[PDB]
Structures are given as C-alpha cells and as structure tokens.
Amino acid sequence: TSGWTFGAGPALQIPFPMQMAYRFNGIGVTQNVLYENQKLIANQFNSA
C-alpha cells in the first residue's frame, strides 16, 4: 500500500500500479513501459 515510505517515516499511500512504475524507473526503464502494458505484467507476474 505504501511501498518503502513507511520505513522512513509516515506511511504514504500511492496506487500500486504507480508503485511498480517507480520501481522500473529505479532500474533505468522508462515508466511508460508499465503504464502501456499494465495487464501483461500483472498477468505474467501472477503465473510466475
């Protein structure tokens, strides 16, 4: 629900789909890769 913000202070809510997009950005992938493929990543994750 809040990613990593609650470990440094107050828990700050953000939608999870947006949490995943920041995480791809942290590894050098542009954030539209998730937003345009949200269903594919969620379905592939669920099987994995």
């Binding site: 937003y35 345009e36 949200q38």
Partner: peptide
Amino acid sequence: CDVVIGIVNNTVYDPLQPELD
C-alpha cells in the same frame, strides 16, 4: 492516450506558442 488506464483530460501549457504567436 488510449492504452494507459486512468488517464485524465487536462491542458498542457506550452510556453513558446503564446509568446511566439
């Protein structure tokens, strides 16, 4: 803007267009 889910409609301001024109 027809593949991302959750898009909202809003105006994006370009600073060049007004001043230039």
